[PDB]
Design a binder for this molecule. Structure first.
Ligand SMILES: CCCCCCCC/C=C/CCCCCCCC(=O)OC[C@H](CO)OC(=O)CCCCCCC/C=C/CCCCCCCC
Ligand SMILES: CCCCCCCC/C=C/CCCCCCCC(=O)OC[C@H](CO)OC(=O)CCCCCCC/C=C/CCCCCCCC
Ligand SMILES: [Ca+2]
Lengths: 322, 105
């Protein structure tokens, strides 16, 4: 309603207050809170979980293609797409006005363009799935009258769209859509830190948070070299024992990455290095390499903790926040 | 005051990972992110290392969604450490600036 008032009466009492810089920050913050509300409300039917198992298909009417029901856009979905178009248009104008170089030279501009592009890719993927479902639906309504798709054997290209989630292809657009949509939603709530500098209590906290992230970035490079040393070394050791291990810890480069990454948080078990065979020499080397990796990782973390403490030891946070 | 910063990070991944895994209720190793409550439970106990990595594993062959959950859950743990590390350092510097005796008396 406030937006409508601006169009009808740009120059009025409402116009001057709406043009205040504080009220234009509040309006932009208010619109984004609505956008996050639309994101949460879009999944409001699944807050307590889904009643239907992913193995069973439910259709609103008997002749419907199942993929039509799971890909159709709802009224909340359309609002999110429009809000993204509105947000992308603002980013495109800033890219054109400011310039394709300065635009990038800002943390928020690249992040905002990143999350809006993932939203567009998520909606583009779902749109492609919707088009495929309609093509399958078009065949049914114009060629099938076989009492709710019971006895009729559809062609394999069209029969695929009557399947449940378990029979979906691993790379079909619907799975890609919700995978990218999840990333965008997580990136969306990161924009809450865009309005945090305005507050006198949480503003300094975000300034110090960004400073630590920049400090950690240079320390990661040191730990990547340590991480890659043991990822290749332990994968090479255990690559030949694929079916001869308690688990799949270091059998592949990916599994070697997974195990060593979650060892940072203590989420990788010691049985990652245990062999089923009697080759104790290789198993004991894996114990030492995995033990050295944990000790080395602590030392790198301990060095990062101490160095960043001394960096802060040398009323400056107030100046940076203001 | 530092919790408020972490609540925003916590709520970002609670909604994001729940949305990702809500459709895989019976298609997961456990009930980690199938509901908003389960998404809250998993992410809260990940602070203390009490949530297993199988929280993100799917029974189906949808490796794209499973690998996104791995990255989102991996980013959440890294982000949570950074927030905790920032809180630890900031509070150390706050104390660096016979005053405890005055406040106690
Ligand atoms: C970039 C930063 C560098 C930091 C350097 C960190 C390395 C220093 C830590 C050393 C702790 C050893 C950490 C290694 C701990 C080994 C953990 C283990 O469970 O092994 C059981 C195995 C078989 O039963 O025991 C042995 O079979 C060997 C005896 C243990 C002594 C091995 C020597 C390890 C490395 C020595 C150098
Ligand atoms: C508010 C404070 C902000 C703090 C910022 C913290 C974020 C920085 C941490 C980044 C560590 C990445 C932490 C992410 C670690 C991923 C953990 C994992 O087990 O994934 C296995 C998956 C599938 O097998 O591996 C991939 O499929 C992808 C390759 C790994 C690289 C992914 C890029 C992740 C994010 C990059 C940005
Ligand atoms: Ca911007």
């Amino acid at each position: 309603f406030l937006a409508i008032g601006y169009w009808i009466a740009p120059c009025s009492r409402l116009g001057k207050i709406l043009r205040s810089p504080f009220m234009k920050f509040v309006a932009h913050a208010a619109s984004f809170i609505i956008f996050l509300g639309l994101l949460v409300f879009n999944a409001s039917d699944r807050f307590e979980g889904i009643t239907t198992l992913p193995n069973i298909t439910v259709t609103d009417y008997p002749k419907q293609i199942f993929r039509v029901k799971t890909t159709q856009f709802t009224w909340t979905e359309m609002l999110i797409m429009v809000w993204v178009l509105g947000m992308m248009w603002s980013e495109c104008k800033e890219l054109w006005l400011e310039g394709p170089r300065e635009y990038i030279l800002q943390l928020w501009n690249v992040l905002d363009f990143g999350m809006l592009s993932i939203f567009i890719a998520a909606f583009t993927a779902r749109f492609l799935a919707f088009l495929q479902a309609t093509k399958a639906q078009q065949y049914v309504d114009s060629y099938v009258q076989e009492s709710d798709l019971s006895e009729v054997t559809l062609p394999p290209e069209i029969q695929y769209f009557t399947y449940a989630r378990d029979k979906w292809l691993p790379s079909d657009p619907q799975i890609i859509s919700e995978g990218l949509y999840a990333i965008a939603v997580v990136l969306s709530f990161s924009r809450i830190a865009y309005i945090l500098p305005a507050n006198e209590s949480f503003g300094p906290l975000q300034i110090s948070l960004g400073r630590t992230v920049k400090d950690i970035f240079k320390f990661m490079v040191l730990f990547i070299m340590v991480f890659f040393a043991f990822m290749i070394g332990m994968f090479i050791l255990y690559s030949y024992y694929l079916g001869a291990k308690v688990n799949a810890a270091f059998t592949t480069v990916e599994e070697s990455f997974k195990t060593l990454f979650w060892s940072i948080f203590g989420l990788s078990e010691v049985t990652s290095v245990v062999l089923k065979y009697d080759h104790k020499f290789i198993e004991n080397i894996g114990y030492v390499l995995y033990g050295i990796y944990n000790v080395t990782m602590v030392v790198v973390l301990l060095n990062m903790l101490i160095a960043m403490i001394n960096s802060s030891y040398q009323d400056d946070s107030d100046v940076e926040w203001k």
